[PDB]
Symmetry: D3
Subunit: 306 residues, 6 copies
Amino acid sequence: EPEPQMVLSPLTSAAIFLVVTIDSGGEDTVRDLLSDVASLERAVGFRAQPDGRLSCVTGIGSEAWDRLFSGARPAGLHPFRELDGPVHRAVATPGDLLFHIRASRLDLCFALATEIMGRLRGAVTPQDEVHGFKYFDERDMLGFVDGTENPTGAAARRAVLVGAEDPAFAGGSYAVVQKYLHDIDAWEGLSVEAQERVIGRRKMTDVELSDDVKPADSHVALTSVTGPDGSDLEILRDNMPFGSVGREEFGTYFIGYARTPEVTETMLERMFLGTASAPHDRILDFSTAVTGSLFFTPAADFLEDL
Amino acid sequence: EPEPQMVLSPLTSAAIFLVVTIDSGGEDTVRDLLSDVASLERAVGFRAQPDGRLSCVTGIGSEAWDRLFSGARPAGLHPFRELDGPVHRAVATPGDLLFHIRASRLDLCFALATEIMGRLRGAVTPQDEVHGFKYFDERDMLGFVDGTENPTGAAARRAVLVGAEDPAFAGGSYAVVQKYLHDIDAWEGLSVEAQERVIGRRKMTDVELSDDVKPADSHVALTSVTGPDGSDLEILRDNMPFGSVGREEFGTYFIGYARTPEVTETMLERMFLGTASAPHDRILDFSTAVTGSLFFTPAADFLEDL
Amino acid sequence: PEPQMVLSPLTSAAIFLVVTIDSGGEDTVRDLLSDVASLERAVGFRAQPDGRLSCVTGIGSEAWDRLFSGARPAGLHPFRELDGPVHRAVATPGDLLFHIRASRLDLCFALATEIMGRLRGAVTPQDEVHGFKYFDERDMLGFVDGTENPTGAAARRAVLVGAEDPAFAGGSYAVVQKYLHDIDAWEGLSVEAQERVIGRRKMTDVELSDDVKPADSHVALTSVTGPDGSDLEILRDNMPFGSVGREEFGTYFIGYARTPEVTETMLERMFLGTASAPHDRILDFSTAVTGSLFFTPAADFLEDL
Amino acid sequence: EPEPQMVLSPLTSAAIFLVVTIDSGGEDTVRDLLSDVASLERAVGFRAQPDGRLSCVTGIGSEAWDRLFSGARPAGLHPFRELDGPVHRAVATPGDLLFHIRASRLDLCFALATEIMGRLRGAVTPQDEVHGFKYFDERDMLGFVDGTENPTGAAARRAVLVGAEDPAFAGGSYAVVQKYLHDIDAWEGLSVEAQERVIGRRKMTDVELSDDVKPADSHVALTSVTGPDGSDLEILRDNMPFGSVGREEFGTYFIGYARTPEVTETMLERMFLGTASAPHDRILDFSTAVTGSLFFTPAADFLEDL
Amino acid sequence: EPEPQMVLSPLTSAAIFLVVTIDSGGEDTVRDLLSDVASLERAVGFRAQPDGRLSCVTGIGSEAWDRLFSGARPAGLHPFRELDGPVHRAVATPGDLLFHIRASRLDLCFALATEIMGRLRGAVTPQDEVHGFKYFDERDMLGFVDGTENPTGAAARRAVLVGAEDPAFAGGSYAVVQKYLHDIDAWEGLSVEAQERVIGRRKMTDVELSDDVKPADSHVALTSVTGPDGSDLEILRDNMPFGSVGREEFGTYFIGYARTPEVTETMLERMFLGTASAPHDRILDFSTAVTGSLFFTPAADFLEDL
Amino acid sequence: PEPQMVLSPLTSAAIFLVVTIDSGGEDTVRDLLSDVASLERAVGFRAQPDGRLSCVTGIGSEAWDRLFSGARPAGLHPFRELDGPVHRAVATPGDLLFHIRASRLDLCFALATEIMGRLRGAVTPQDEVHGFKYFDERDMLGFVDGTENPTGAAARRAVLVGAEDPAFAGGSYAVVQKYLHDIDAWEGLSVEAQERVIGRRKMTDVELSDDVKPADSHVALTSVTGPDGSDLEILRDNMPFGSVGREEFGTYFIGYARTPEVTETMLERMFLGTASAPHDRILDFSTAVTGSLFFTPAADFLEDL
Ligand code: HEM
Ligand code: HEM
Ligand code: HEM
Ligand code: HEM
């Protein structure tokens, strides 16, 4: 039975997202770090038990996989595809390795990130680093509760973990990341009621708008997709706020896990390219994506054994 | 396995119990809310991750079931059976829907109860509303630790959840509720030692009395029942204190979950009607039941699917 | 002169008990008053350090005359009914107030049980409210409630009797009103409309600009300057309460001040209005169902009965 | 169907370790106690839900097994084997019953130990009693983080619980205990760098030394044992610090659980008897074992059915 | 303005009490350590801000005072006075220095005690070391809440601190310590009602018994003392439970602070020698004193100015 | 005179914001200064009782003259650059300092958002640092940091302006410097060598004895006596910060004192050395990249604008 990485674990109060590219000739140094990353997580994490809640999920991109490994490859692993809508675009930016580090305190995340980057220095080039923080009662920088409809329990396992469809990679998952910056000045000019129509839920109480008032181009309408079984396709989102007040940077770091990239991609196509009933997701009128990458997060034992 | 509601979840520090009857003509409104209640739970509950521990268990009575649904019925669902003992009576009182709401804080329970009732206004009449609170080290209003011998783990699952005996309803449970008021002035007139003999356990330390000293009419003796096989029949109790000091109202809200009502009903018969060895449970000389209702709590997917 | 715990902060749980003293019950009450500090310690010590149990005991004007034979606090009088053109602040019976707070309801309940156990047969209960914290210090209107309370030395100056009434130094005056809200009407307003009623932004609790704040907003009417241009302050320990089945959504108002004049001036502005404002808009969504005034003596006064 | 005792549970901030021998004629008293131990744990532990985390693991030694039970014995149950190295000795000391009591607070541990010993008064003689406490960020008295490489999850179940190889005792485990006292004066005369070389991990950060700096006589190198197939053999350690400053007693109470004693014994052999490259584990130059006992901890249901 | 040591601080969940005698020739080493104890406390304590709550109060006995210092001595500093009652005795045992160490966690107490004793090795001989722990809801080993009637605020300052009656030593205090062991077997043979009559308060609820039913040989009656001017004489008690279950040692470590030893001695005389209406305190029928020492705890600046 | 929260303890989160005031920005700034206590309460009240939000506002020497007429604080001047033979304490621009602390970053960030929202178009940001607690009060060098800060009466005497400048009593002076560390070089030292640089034991935080403590150790050089025979003390609220990808491992130094002369004396000793030490060894591993000096007025001074 393969052991997944901590892709099912809940939101925490602190996170570091690190994305790097592998320099020419850095492959061996990377493979050696990948075999040790669980050890490094325990080394730091055990110090803060029982309430540290440190974890690290490590992901590998498509191009990187092809450089690192001469054997089998996950069936759905491909580069993130840029989506160039009429107005808004989902950019594809470089990234070979993802480290999604979470804990109840930033120090633990920073200590682990330090140890990882110490072992990769000279073999990789940093592309992005974000230090995320919880904002009040699980809110995002738009002021809405963010994560409510994430799946839990068995539904989450079914939605997130690779299974018998790709048995060599059972227990893995697919992560899509996008860094979004928000136009807070424009957003704060809307009434609360107008903001609710953009999102599709009530702002203070987090209750969904009824079907007969929710606009077709609201975020919740466009990211609600019925599957063949009539169910509703699900992903697990671990989005975190970030920002810098002096630079007027108010951000949402989007990370979504799914058993196949097709689910996440379908949602992105609906948001950016629109539907018959909606030109594009109105959240994008206040949000700009500035990164976009796709990674496979293998089973823990995959990493330990290479 | 089907996904149960949160019937196996532990005691919390705050609860709201709401029992309502469905008005004539209110059935469609109720069905629509039933299909939404999990959504509403997540709407409020996600705000307080990770410590809020909000849950809501929804139950449906026997008469209401036939008004709401055609076709299949759970095998054990029937109206609560009034027990008229020589001295003490377990009354049957009206109740179509139960909402058992728990959290670590009363605000979450109140917020959810507000949303539920807002969606039911004009379609239901409230019958009972109790706001329960933890009392010191898991004590009840009689001053005894209350919940000790609840089953845990796999034993709890076997005792509480419908299984292969009624497969279309697997993952459901049966809840019996009774609101009890205590005669605290008479109770406080007993010595500690006399109270221990009523209950069957030591007051301060919660250790069970030895079998040579435990009276036949003690509460623990009468609610310990073996199956024909010789296993204990267990139920899961989530009893909470409640009260009002000005009205001299000191209560225990009894709620017990079981895989079939027959177990809870056997215990109630022993308590109210007695055995050859005991006329009745001595706890009832200090405890008056003022409500009594029976509900089936379906698996979560039953409610989601309408 | 050691005060009662009138300066202490909001807690997550509270019980408010108001009783009247039955004829013949005076001696029982005096014995309880002398023991209430003892009872508080008896329960509270169990939950060190984080129980934060306290009890503030208040005595009304009528009761004072029945219990005590000496001087009266200078500002003590029965709550004055205010009959506005539209809204009324009712005066309701109440001789003794127990304002019980802790971080957990069980401590409040255990202490109230002990107090009422000593008083049974001597007092009649008039009101009992079990208050609870609602999210991030919100009230049932969905606004943060308590923000502009004074702190530190400013609170002491605003709340405690001093040299103006030296026999009663260290006391305070408490005004209580139980309010029920019409939540259906309130939820019919847009958020921005609700902000104009209160005078602060709903989600972030930032005060509206002086040039945008309506004259009949709550914050505008309860902001009062004394003749010297200094702000008149009170200390509020309001708690939410309610019952969903009865559609009871409430604010239990309690405010402490050094003299009732300050609290009364605010009530007059709210219910009777000014030249600018007919009445406080908050009252279009809030009905007062009780109204009582109490003096909360220094702790030593009760101990020396 | 076999329910383990709580041998897989995590470290806690408080523990009591109690070892007793059974007096001639005390066998019936002990059997009666063993059948009630779970009941005593619930009696005390329920008082401190949800954060008390009280558990008790009960172990039975080789000689005691034969005096208490007739029938099958566990395959691996024998007396602790003394190891007489050239310099350092692993002593064998008496012990029939082990009670490993853990909680987040010492009071809960002490209250349960009181109830257990109250029932055993007259039937047993105490041999050892240690009250353990968490020291900073999971450090031992040598100043190093202690516990880091314990297995978790499925790997822990595989390393610790008896299975198909001894099916009558499935769900049990073997515990080895050793009380160590440290020579802190000698230890504190080593540089940090020298201490790191004794242990094989960085002191402050708990990061493992790489294979090339890691001495072959370091504690980590000697307790790293690979089985026939190239796989690590693992144990689960719940060691706790203890001490008395006035008597200069600074100790580590060692307790290690494993599915077979052979794993734990091999590690001990490497420590005390050494390898081709290492005469003995350098940790023992600063640590003296003053007790040594081996116990079988049965499945919970085994104890209940007495 | 003399700054006192932390003698007015509240009870904590953990404590270490250390009593040592000063070896002949150890005086200079002890003086140096006295001058550094505040420094050492800061060094350990700062690591656990804001919740560590570490403090250390240092006391010096009468005989030691005269070995360490020259000049004027505190007015009430004498050796503990043995009380030989008809039935029970308050023994006097050796002790030159007291370290009363408190914190919210034992590790902090132990770390500080290690540092202190490290500086004193070879200059002192340990006499007593007790590790105290909070027991449920501020209970003692007799099962009663213990500390309720301690003075607070200005009343505590007035009861505890030396003032103008001995102005050279203003800001100091006197500490009496006695280690008590209890006869729990005898105690548990009493009914709860009989135990209440021994103490003078209700067991479970901690409410004081009425004047009419409170016995005259009850503990609370005998330790309630008024002076000639009608004022209540008070002390501040920081008692902690301690024990060892195997040795059947169930203890109260008594420590009481007062501005003159005469108050504490008057209570001890009433307890051990009795009054007109009571032969002795009934609590002593279940409690034996095994140590007895008196210390002066100087103002902080006195120590620093060494 | 009520001080700002300059005596308050370290917290787990902090934001340090330094801005300069643009052409014509003075009126906007003055209006925000008069409101900053109000904004602090607006946000902070939401997180009672655990949030521990505070904001200390400082004003630089040049900005003082732009914003206010009348008296200046006696000790206010531009930060003095120190060009040592090897190491330099640089001066960089800064008109306003906001030192924001809480138990959680969200509270800091919310307050900083509201402040900057009011200052948009009036100020240019110079520096923004988000500090976090690192294990048991450690800095990025791995040492416990803050141990010897004064407390209680000693801290009030060391930090608050008094009768020496009575118009400004209750104020203080803050020096800030952002330091970046050469962690690769530092980690090249043994623990024992690092202890000799700092002057305390690394794991246990106990001070080295006078026998063993080097004269160019940090603790030696920053222990300064005044003629009074008195230790000169400052109150430090430094916080770690950093970025792993940029190899940025920092200490944000902020030190409060009743006069800048104390802090400047320690800076001189560190950067320029003494008869017995060329410079503080900590500077061989630490580079200052900002330096600014501010006066933090009493709270009532800001309120009164
Ligand atoms: C329906 C009952 C009430 C509700 C729901 C309510 C709610 C609020 C809210 C949300 C605020 C703004 C935040 C704050 O500073 O606390 C506020 C402010 C205030 N309220 Fe009320 N309040 C009520 C009744 C009263 C009454 C009866 C009085 C006085 C007799 C009063 C006096 C104040 C004062 C003095 C302020 C602070 C104004 C300032 O200086 O900005 N309130 N109240
Ligand atoms: C003086 C008594 C002991 C002390 C202070 C001690 C301390 C430590 C420390 C600090 C570590 C490194 C961190 C960790 O993974 O836990 C360690 C690892 C370990 N210890 Fe010990 N230990 C002691 C006795 C023992 C004994 C008696 C055994 C086995 C019989 C044992 C088995 C192990 C094992 C299996 C590991 C993990 C090694 C690895 O795979 O990396 N220890 N111990
Ligand atoms: C033998 C072990 C002792 C135990 C277990 C014990 C226990 C208690 C208990 C349960 C109380 C009532 C609650 C409270 O107010 O703290 C109490 C009160 C008190 N005890 Fe003791 N005590 C002991 C020894 C002493 C000694 C030796 C002294 C004095 C020399 C003392 C002085 C007091 C005082 C002054 C009170 C408060 C009485 C009042 O004013 O109500 N106790 N103690
Ligand atoms: C460069 C980054 C700095 C770091 C990492 C650092 C670190 C430390 C450390 C670890 C201590 C010992 C523990 C303590 O008492 O806090 C210390 C003490 C001290 N530091 Fe620094 N420090 C820095 C810069 C400064 C600066 C710039 C000043 C003054 C202008 C200063 C003044 C002090 C003082 C006054 C003490 C206390 C010395 C004593 O009385 O024992 N520090 N610092």
